[PDB]
Design a protein around this ligand. Structure first.
Ligand SMILES: CCCCCCCCCCCCCCCCCC(=O)OC[C@H](COP(=O)([O-])OCC(O)COP(=O)([O-])OC[C@@H](COC(=O)CCCCCCCCCCCCCCCCC)OC(=O)CCCCCCCCCCCCCCCCC)OC(=O)CCCCCCCCCCCCCCCCC
Ligand SMILES: CCCCCCCCCCCCCCCCCC(=O)OC[C@H](COP(=O)([O-])OCC(O)COP(=O)([O-])OC[C@@H](COC(=O)CCCCCCCCCCCCCCCCC)OC(=O)CCCCCCCCCCCCCCCCC)OC(=O)CCCCCCCCCCCCCCCCC
Ligand SMILES: CCCCCCCCCCCCCCCCC[C@@H](O)O[C@H](CO[C@H](O)CCCCCCCCCCCCCCC)COP(=O)(O)OCC[N+](C)(C)C
Ligand SMILES: CCCCCCCCCCCCCCCCC[C@@H](O)O[C@H](CO[C@H](O)CCCCCCCCCCCCCCC)COP(=O)(O)OCC[N+](C)(C)C
Ligand SMILES: CCCCCCCCCCCCCCCCC[C@@H](O)O[C@H](CO[C@H](O)CCCCCCCCCCCCCCC)COP(=O)(O)OCC[N+](C)(C)C
Ligand SMILES: CCCCCCCC/C=C\CCCCCCCC(=O)OC[C@H](COP(=O)(O)OCCN)OC(=O)CCCCCCC/C=C\CCCCCCCC
Ligand SMILES: CCCCCCCC/C=C\CCCCCCCC(=O)O[C@H](COC(=O)CCCCCCC/C=C/CCCCCCCC)COP(=O)(O)OCCN
Ligand SMILES: Nc1ncnc2c1ncn2[C@@H]1O[C@H](COP(=O)(O)OP(=O)(O)O)[C@@H](O)[C@H]1O
Lengths: 54, 347, 459, 107, 98, 121, 48, 320
């Protein structure tokens, strides 16, 4: 009743997925709105696209 | 602004898009992009405030950089072959540069950072225009040059767009940011099928445009830009909230609604090309978009949030201005699945 | 087959155009007439099927499920008449519309000659039930229950769509007749293993399989009475139906790919039956009992023998009827006590004797008392498992023991003992509730006279 | 602390309304006696009288489309024919081997 | 492809990197954009003149004009931003965020 | 497929002249009825949005909705049928012109095909 | 005896600038109801 | 053809209707001062349209039938109970203040719409400006909390940032003992319970804040009790002055078109009066809101649009 059904079966599939998605959402959406970082990342991805793929 | 000047600017935006769509010379396509941006900048600042100016300047910076890289790719393609016609490119470096420029224009990740900010800064009507009409020209150019695109880069940015939209939409209470992230995810879905079939790209574009038009017109009707301001709508006009919930369910790809039609077909097409892992990842990722659509539906129509006392006075007034084609948009965004085989019309 | 589809579609206009005080009567009468019409599907033939057209076809597996689906709706309307009394006419019509749409999708799902149409309707059913759970639910946990129910299903089901489109691209068709006739063995390969997993997960998630069942107590406890009835009786069987359709293309892989699920179900029926012994909620107890019975059904389907399939069909029908009746009785108690706690309202045999005998009969069918069809399904599945491996009898016998134990525990705690002193609003049982119980229980004891009607296509 | 301890403006929770107190012999279908009585009548007639009894009788007398007695008669005549002529009842080969072309091994 | 084309392409890349660096002074962003345009004009003119593609001689002028229009647009926007903050600092543009 | 570059394709024709050699869809087509139903649904949605009696507010408006939907659906069905007919025509022509890539399989009978048997135990 | 509906406390979850507040974004403040932010002639001495 | 972008495109301009007589005037004064009679006389003499002061049921007189509706459906507040029990636990004081501010905003929108559409000027009582004096009076008296005044300030800022302030503001100055005697002679039992501190605080808010802040952007005519009866002189000073410091001269056809879009379509005027900030005095539970809205829908001419209500006698429904 408690150890597997209420705790571990919840911890494995739903709770872990929710935690991971929440953490990734926080990481993605936490941008200060400063374009310095945006265009620095733009330069990085432009160089990466030029070099790695071809 | 003056209504005549507003009509002139809107017509100039549409004329730039049409000039991109109807021309076969790369210089004319670049000119059409330039005209589209030049006429679009004022529309974003139709209501003057610091936020609108910030959105307009960010949009101008990104679009000007994208146009300059577009011209760079065009001139390199001319260098390695004296051709001005828009066809398969003759140089790989120019091809990657053109792909990145068009991805920046569309908002595909990692060039997605400007979309939520520009959408939040501008009003709802400008956001509707930006998220619907501004996706036509770059997608038309991509459909024209699809045969030369490298699948690896194009699909990498498609999958990145889907993942980024799904993750970024989960953290938003503002409705315009939610719309921007949803648009990023749908552009990611659109892009992932360009190497294999452009008819599927056009089908997804049309369905998404219908769904976004319905969403934005419903948001304009109930003048709400946040979750909590929208939560008050049930106490004035519940029919709007019910239609909005059905539209949100359709946008999440739930069968038997219209939003299931693109993904389904897209998956089908990808399966024809021995691609199995990517469609699976894309579907499980679109589950995130469905999640935050469901959260919006929960806070909007499936529960009744507390109201305010002044609401009573708003009960005595009707909407003076009506948006025509709203019922048509809702019906076309919810109940067109049984007519899926019409895509042979090459929409 | 359109002779059943069109009248169901016809119910929606009738409900909307009906008088503010005549919706329930019209809906119940015409749904009962449609249920009567559906009985013509029971005249099956020992040969292939009743292939009505290119789109729909009926079998001896689809016919009992269709009859049960059509029969449920009047009972759901009868049960929903009570707690929607203070509800506006537009919203009552919306609730009836949700029920009608759910029944239409369920009807079109079982015929569904092609697999993609089956998937489309099989996932279309997900929307009306989600709306019913998240709108007309009392507690604040209905939102979480709806989210769990939606996402478990969709996560399990999307790889099924990918697998189906792949199979159609490789074989050229997804029509069930062509699939059955042109069937070929599945080679022992990693790609074939993952195709098997994709084809299997979607239906294992909604039985539900043990470990993948966490959404079910949530969705069933927090849903309204009609939602609970339709969830327990019909929506759980869909996956079962789906398996008996798809496992025709998964041989001989199923010979060893079924070991994890066989072990999971065999241990999970014991685990859930033991969970039922320590439960402070009636609806949770009924939900976990449903989980145990569907675990037995999973074992039956995975064994892949004719007796297994006959037992599985009989068990699905019997469990649907029994669980619907149990939920209705629990809701009759709840509408008086407003607590949904098993230990609070006690000694109700003294105050509601006919409700007490209804509880007794429902529990007895839950005990799988012969010669009821619950016992028929149980015994067929047990015999098939014994043929599969003689050691399974330990687990099946232990499950039978615990099932009898918790069923009689549920009966004794609520009906026997001394009444609670401070509860003085135990009104006499209404004629509507007694009619609902009778219309639940009489079909079971009438089906025990003609078992071949619900023993499936392998009879 | 000048707070009124009231978080908002809300109606009180209304009490359960007994359908028996205003109308005895109430049948529990509706709060209007005429509509309630007709609901009881239609439910009982269409469920117990029409569907439950006539449907059960219709199911009981369904023609043998499964061909149980047909198979019984076919088996009876096959058994009679094979016992009269001394055939070995059922044969162990479902299909006669004269039309099965096994692959020659040459191992 | 001789060394002159390489040098002009490298100048374009340097201007693009400088535009993407964004230390401060949005005026510098506009300046880097216009240096990118100048490099584009220069090497496009070289390509067209080398190949003697007569009808293409109009293309640079056109490009120039259009790009200059954008500069005006950008300049106007810059002024607006200053009118709200007093300076054209890039870090003042942080009201809207992801 | 990608028949955009198909030879002899008029750049902006909704329905070519050869499409007239195909049977037009019947006015009682189920898809045409579905478009009419979609138009009726749009009319009802319009009545609901403007706070009017949904079923019986504007009969002329609902009639126009249904009529326009049926009109556009008829032409759309014609175009779709023509496009599918073109696909089938090109398929059959390509199969006919390349017999080396679509050879005829020698008919083999199940009495002489060895299939592995997998017992269920 | 009554179906639960959201109260003020339940609604305060959706009133923040972002979902799932963090230590860094605790500082972030919600935008104005109307989307306008507060804005927050030279002298010359011509001498001899 | 309702006025919109097309009407402005073809012919509709609002600068050809202004004839220097628009000059929207508002008259401000303490409770029981003769500002209403003076405003009515000014409107009569100058040919302007008089707007009686906004009450609880002002909006009820502009929609459907002019008859007021129930207090439960319109306002959910009463002035008499505020006078009887200003410190009650149900928050009637701030609910009344917020409803009165919303009604005043709607009245100002109607007056501006009339002035722009016809060109004839209008005269008003206490406008959205000077509505804050009552808010301050309740706050210093302890009737309402600080959260209420902060919410009022937010709503007032967001709403009043979009309308042109009046040209002429007229203040009638009556000392607190005089208006106290006037109240005592009025005969209204609930008005007798107004404390002298409340009237003193209203006058203090008028003099200390409202008058100086209006004087910096427009022209003020501060009049005492004796100089208020001779309306001829009041009209004389009204006509003599010329407004060159307000924003009205700076307005032109484009701004006038935007303002005329704003003033009509009252749902945008009242849009920000219902911002989702949950003050216990004004926020309402879901069940009460649901049942009250359902009751409001049941009203005779309120279920559908005004032209689609059969029970109030609308015909030709199926062809409109
Ligand atoms: C397999 C496919 C087959 C099935 C198809 C299904 C879809 C078909 C219809 C699609 C939509 C078209 C019509 C909808 C119009 C909306 C108007 C409305 O709200 O209803 C009010 C109106 C009655 O109310 P009223 O007195 O006029 O005024 C009240 C106000 O309108 C409003 O009253 P109010 O404001 O006072 O009440 C408030 C209420 C009002 O708000 C609403 O109810 C809005 C309606 C919901 C939005 C519709 C969705 C758009 C289409 C998507 C459909 C999704 C289906 C896919 C499956 C997923 C399920 C979601 O809002 C709420 O209560 C919110 C809380 C509820 C939570 C959300 C509920 C879930 C919504 C999803 C509904 C999906 C099915 C819709 C079925 C039809 C509903 C009317 O209903 C109608 O009368 C129209 C019904 C249809 C008319 C039939 C007439 C024909 C009969 C005679 C001819 C016979 C024909 C056969 C020929 C043979 C003869 C011989
Ligand atoms: C296929 C892919 C489709 C892509 C999606 C389509 C984009 C739709 C948006 C385009 C324009 C935006 C818009 O009209 O508002 C959205 C509109 C809702 O109206 P709204 O947002 O409330 O209007 C706000 C205005 O900005 C309020 O501004 P206003 O009060 O100054 O209104 C002035 C009005 C009145 O204009 C006039 O006064 C006419 C005077 C003639 C001047 C001649 C000068 C020529 C030089 O003119 C307009 O509203 C814009 C003129 C558009 C005509 C361009 C040709 O919804 C739609 O237009 C959706 C239409 C459905 C999609 C198109 C067809 C289906 C495909
Ligand atoms: C919700 C679905 C999307 C909205 C549906 C459309 C609604 C508005 C349409 C109203 C009329 C528009 C039709 C256009 C009139 C003339 C068309 C003609 O001039 O152009 C043809 C073009 O016509 C279009 O191909 C067909 C348009 C029909 C779109 C509907 C199909 C959408 C998919 C099915 C979803 C359900 C639809 C049914 C419900 C309404 C020729 O195309 P062509 O210049 O040579 O090649 C360009 C395309 N390429 C490059 C890809 C090859
Ligand atoms: C949590 C509640 C239940 C959720 C669902 C549970 C059901 C999922 C379980 C999946 C069933 C089995 C998956 C793969 C089984 C293959 C057979 C394997 O077990 O046996 C050996 C396989 O060898 C090793 O196992 C290699 C695989 C090792 C790595 C796989 C991970 C195994 C455990 C993962 C469980 C995680 C479950 C949840 C995932 C999200 C035999 O070795 P070999 O004869 O040479 O190879 C035979 C297979 N060939 C012929 C195709 C090549
Ligand atoms: C209150 C105290 C008691 C008072 C009453 C006293 C009388 C008691 C007598 C009744 C019980 C004693 C047993 C007597 C049984 C006789 C009838 C039975 O033998 O007939 C069965 C027949 O019963 C039916 O087959 C079963 C009834 C149908 C059940 C369907 C339920 C109706 C629809 C309801 C909705 C469905 C929901 C569930 C979905 C599956 C089997 O007959 P069978 O020998 O074989 O063939 C019929 C004759 N032939 C040979 C000519 C063909
Ligand atoms: C790689 C990408 C894979 C994407 C997988 C999609 C999973 C679909 C669900 C994603 C939702 C995750 C986000 C989330 O749950 O938010 C945390 C949220 C916080 O509550 P909020 O409503 O956001 O805020 C209220 C208070 N202000 O926590 C929750 O409440 C979670 C409740 C819903 C969970 C339902 C069950 C989901 C998991 C079921 C198993 C299926 C997993 C899907 C993938 C399986 C792997 C094959
Ligand atoms: C309730 C939550 C459950 C969530 C669902 C999980 C189901 C897991 C099943 C796998 C999903 C995708 C399977 C692909 C669909 C079948 C298509 C197929 O078989 O084609 C295979 C494709 O096979 C794959 O790509 C499988 C890769 C798996 C990717 C996703 C991994 C997900 C996690 C895997 C481990 C766990 C699996 C079981 C988990 C059970 C649920 C807990 C190869 O085809 P070809 O390449 O064209 O031919 C071979 C010669 N070229
Ligand atoms: N903003 C407000 N808050 C509370 N009460 C107000 C407000 N505005 C007006 N009132 C009340 O309206 C009543 C009548 O207004 P008033 O003009 O002062 O008297 P009269 O109509 O007799 O000239 C007064 O009792 C006054 O207190």
């Amino acid at each position: 009743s408690s150890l597997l059904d209420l705790i571990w079966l919840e911890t494995i599939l739903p709770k872990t997925t929710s935690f991971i998605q929440m953490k990734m959402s926080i990481m993605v959406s936490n941008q200060k709105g400063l374009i310095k970082l945006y265009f620095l990342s733009f330069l990085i991805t432009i160089m990466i696209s030029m070099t790695l793929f071809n | 602004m003056n209504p005549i000047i507003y009509t002139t600017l809107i017509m100039t935006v549409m004329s730039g898009t049409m000039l991109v769509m109807i021309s076969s010379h790369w210089l004319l396509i670049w000119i059409g992009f330039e005209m589209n941006l030049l006429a679009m900048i004022p529309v974003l600042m139709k209501n003057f405030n610091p936020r609108a100016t910030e959105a307009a300047t960010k949009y101008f910076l990104t679009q000007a950089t994208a146009s300059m890289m577009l011209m760079m790719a065009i001139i390199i393609n001319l260098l390695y072959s004296g051709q001005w016609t828009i066809t398969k490119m003759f140089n790989p470096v120019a091809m990657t540069m053109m792909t990145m420029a068009l991805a920046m224009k569309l908002g595909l990740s990692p060039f997605h950072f400007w979309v939520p900010e520009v959408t939040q800064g501008i009003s709802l009507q400008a956001g509707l225009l930006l998220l619907t009409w501004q996706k036509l020209a770059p997608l038309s150019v991509l459909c024209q040059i699809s045969q030369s695109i490298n699948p690896n880069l194009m699909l990498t940015m498609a999958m990145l767009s889907i993942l980024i939209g799904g993750w970024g939409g989960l953290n938003q209470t503002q409705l315009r940011k939610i719309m921007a992230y949803s648009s990023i995810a749908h552009m990611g879905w659109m892009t992932a099928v360009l190497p294999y079939n452009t008819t599927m790209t056009i089908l997804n574009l049309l369905i998404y445009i219908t769904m976004t038009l319905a969403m934005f017109m419903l948001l304009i009707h109930s003048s709400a830009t946040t979750t909590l301001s929208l939560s008050h709508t049930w106490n004035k006009m519940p029919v709007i909230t019910s239609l909005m919930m059905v539209t949100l369910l359709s946008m999440g790809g739930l069968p038997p609604l219209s939003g299931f039609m693109p993904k389904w077909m897209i998956i089908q097409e990808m399966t024809k090309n021995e691609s199995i892992i990517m469609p699976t990842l894309m579907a499980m990722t679109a589950l995130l978009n469905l999640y935050f659509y469901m959260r919006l539906a929960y806070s909007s129509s499936l529960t009744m949030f507390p109201s305010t006392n002044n609401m009573k006075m708003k009960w005595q007034f009707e909407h003076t201005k009506q948006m025509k084609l709203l019922p048509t948009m809702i019906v076309l965004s919810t109940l067109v699945l049984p007519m899926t085989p019409a895509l042979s019309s090459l929409n | 087959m359109l002779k059943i589809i069109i009248p169901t579609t016809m119910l929606l206009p009738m409900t909307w155009m009906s008088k503010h005080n005549m919706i329930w009567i019209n809906a119940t009468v015409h749904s009962l007439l449609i249920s009567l019409i559906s009985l013509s599907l029971l005249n099956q033939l020992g040969e292939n099927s009743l292939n009505f057209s290119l789109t729909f076809f009926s079998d001896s597996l689809s016919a009992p499920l269709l009859v049960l689906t059509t029969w449920l709706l009047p009972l759901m309307l009868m049960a929903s008449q009570s707690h929607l009394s203070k509800e506006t006419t537009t919203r009552k019509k919306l609730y009836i519309t949700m029920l009608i749409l759910l029944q239409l999708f369920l009807i079109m799902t079982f015929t569904a000659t092609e697999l993609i149409l089956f998937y489309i309707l099989f996932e279309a059913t997900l929307v009306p039930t989600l709306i019913i759970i998240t709108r007309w639910g009392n507690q604040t946990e209905r939102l979480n229950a709806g989210l769990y129910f939606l996402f478990y299903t969709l996560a399990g089901s999307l790889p099924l769509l990918v697998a189906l489109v792949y199979i159609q691209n490789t074989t050229g068709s997804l029509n069930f007749l062509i699939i059955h006739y042109w069937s070929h063995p599945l080679s022992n390969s990693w790609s074939n293993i993952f195709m098997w997993l994709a084809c299997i997960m979607a239906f294992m998630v909604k039985m539900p399989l043990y470990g993948l069942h966490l959404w079910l107590p949530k969705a069933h406890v927090e849903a309204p009475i009609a939602g609970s009835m339709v969830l327990a009786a019909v929506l759980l069987k869909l996956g079962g139906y789906g398996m008996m359709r798809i496992t025709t293309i998964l041989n001989p892989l199923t010979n060893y790919m079924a070991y994890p699920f066989l072990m999971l179900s065999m241990w999970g029926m014991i685990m859930t039956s033991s969970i039922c012994l320590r439960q402070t909620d009636l609806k949770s107890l009924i939900a976990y009992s449903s989980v145990s019975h569907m675990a037995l059904v999973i074992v039956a389907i995975m064994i892949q023998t004719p007796w297994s399939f006959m037992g599985a069909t009989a068990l699905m029908i019997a469990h649907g009827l029994t669980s619907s009746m149990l939920f209705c009785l629990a809701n009759t108690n709840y509408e008086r006590v407003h607590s949904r706690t098993m230990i609070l309202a006690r000694g109700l045999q003294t105050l509601l004797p006919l409700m007490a005998t209804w509880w007794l009969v429902a529990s007895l069918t839950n005990l799988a008392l012969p010669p009821s069809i619950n016992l028929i399904g149980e015994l067929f599945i047990i015999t098939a498992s014994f043929s599969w491996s003689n050691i399974t009898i330990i687990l099946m016998g232990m499950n039978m023991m615990i099932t009898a134990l918790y069923s009689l525990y549920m009966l004794i705690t609520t009906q026997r003992g001394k009444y609670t002193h401070h509860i003085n609003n135990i009104k006499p049982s209404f004629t509507r509730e007694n009619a609902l119980m009778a219309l639940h229980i009489l079909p079971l004891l009438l089906l025990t006279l003609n078992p071949k009607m619900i023993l499936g296509p392998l009879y | 602390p000048p707070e009124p301890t009231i978080r908002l403006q809300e109606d009180p929770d209304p009490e359960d309304e007994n359908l028996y107190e205003k109308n005895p012999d109430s049948h529990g279908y509706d709060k209007d006696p005429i509509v309630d009585l007709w609901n009881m009548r239609v439910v009982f007639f269409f469920g117990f009288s029409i569907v439950l009894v006539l449907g059960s009788t219709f199911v009981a007398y369904l023609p043998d489309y499964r061909m149980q007695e047909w198979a019984r008669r076919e088996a009876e005549r096959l058994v009679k024919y094979r016992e009269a002529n001394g055939l070995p009842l059922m044969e162990s080969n479902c299909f006669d081997p004269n039309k099965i072309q096994l692959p020659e091994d040459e191992d | 492809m001789p060394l002159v084309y390489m040098n002009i392409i490298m100048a374009f890349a340097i201007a693009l990197a400088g535009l993407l660096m964004y230390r401060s002074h949005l005026m510098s962003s506009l300046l880097c954009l216009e240096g990118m345009m100048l490099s584009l004009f220069i090497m496009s003119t070289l390509i067209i003149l080398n190949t003697h593609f007569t009808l293409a001689n109009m293309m640079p002028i056109i490009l120039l004009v259009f790009a200059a229009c954008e500069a005006a647009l950008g300049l106007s926007l810059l002024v607006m931003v200053s009118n709200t903050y007093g300076t054209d600092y890039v870090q003042n543009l942080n009201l809207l965020q992801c | 497929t990608m028949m955009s570059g198909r030879p002899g394709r008029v750049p902006l024709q909704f329905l070519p002249n050869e499409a007239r050699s195909l049977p037009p869809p019947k006015l009682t087509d189920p898809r045409l009825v579905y478009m009419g139903f979609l138009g009726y649904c749009s009319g009802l949605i319009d009545n609901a949005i403007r706070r009017r009696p949904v079923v019986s507010a504007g009969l002329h408006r609902q009639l126009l909705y249904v009529t326009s939907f049926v009109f556009f659906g008829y032409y759309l069905l014609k175009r779709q049928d023509y496009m599918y007919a073109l696909r089938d025509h090109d398929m059959f022509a390509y199969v006919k012109s390349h017999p080396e890539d679509f050879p005829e399989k020698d008919k083999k009978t199940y009495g002489e095909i060895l299939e592995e048997f997998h017992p269920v135990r | 005896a009554r179906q639960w509906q959201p109260d003020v406390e339940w609604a305060e979850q959706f009133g923040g600038a972002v979902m799932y507040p963090t230590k860094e974004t605790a500082h972030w403040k919600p935008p104005p109801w109307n989307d306008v932010d507060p804005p927050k002639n030279l002298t010359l001495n011509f001498g001899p | 053809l309702q006025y919109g972008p097309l009407a402005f495109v073809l012919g509709e301009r609002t600068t050809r209707k202004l004839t220097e007589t628009s000059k929207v005037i508002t008259v401000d004064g303490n409770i029981c001062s003769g500002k209403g009679r003076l405003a009515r006389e000014i409107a009569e003499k100058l040919g302007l349209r008089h707007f009686p002061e906004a009450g609880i049921h002002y909006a009820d007189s502009t929609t459907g039938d002019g008859k007021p509706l129930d207090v439960q459906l319109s306002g959910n507040c009463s002035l008499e109970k505020f006078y009887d029990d200003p410190k009650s636990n149900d928050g009637n004081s701030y609910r009344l203040q917020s409803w009165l501010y919303a009604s005043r905003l709607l009245q100002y929108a109607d007056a501006l719409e009339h002035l722009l559409s016809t060109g004839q000027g209008v005269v008003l009582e206490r406008s959205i400006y000077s509505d804050f004096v009552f808010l301050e009076a309740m706050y210093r008296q302890g009737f309402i909390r600080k959260q209420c005044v902060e919410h009022y300030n937010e709503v007032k800022k967001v709403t009043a940032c979009e309308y042109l302030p009046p040209h002429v503001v007229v203040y009638v100055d009556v000392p607190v003992p005089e208006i106290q005697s006037r109240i005592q002679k009025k005969g209204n039992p609930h008005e007798m319970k107004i404390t002298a501190a409340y009237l003193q605080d209203i006058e203090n808010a008028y003099k200390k804040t409202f008058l100086p802040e209006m004087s910096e952007k427009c022209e003020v005519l501060q009049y005492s009790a004796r100089e208020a009866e001779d309306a001829e002189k009041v009209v004389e000073d009204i006509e003599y002055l010329k407004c060159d410091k307000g924003p009205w001269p700076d307005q032109d056809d484009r701004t006038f078109h935007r303002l005329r879009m704003l003033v009509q379509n009252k749902l945008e005027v009242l849009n920000y009066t219902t911002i989702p900030v949950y003050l216990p005095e004004i926020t309402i539970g879901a069940h009460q809101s649901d049942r009250v809205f359902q009751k409001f829908t049941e009203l005779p001419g309120r279920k559908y649009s005004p032209g689609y209500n059969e029970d109030v006698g609308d015909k030709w429904i199926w062809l409109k």
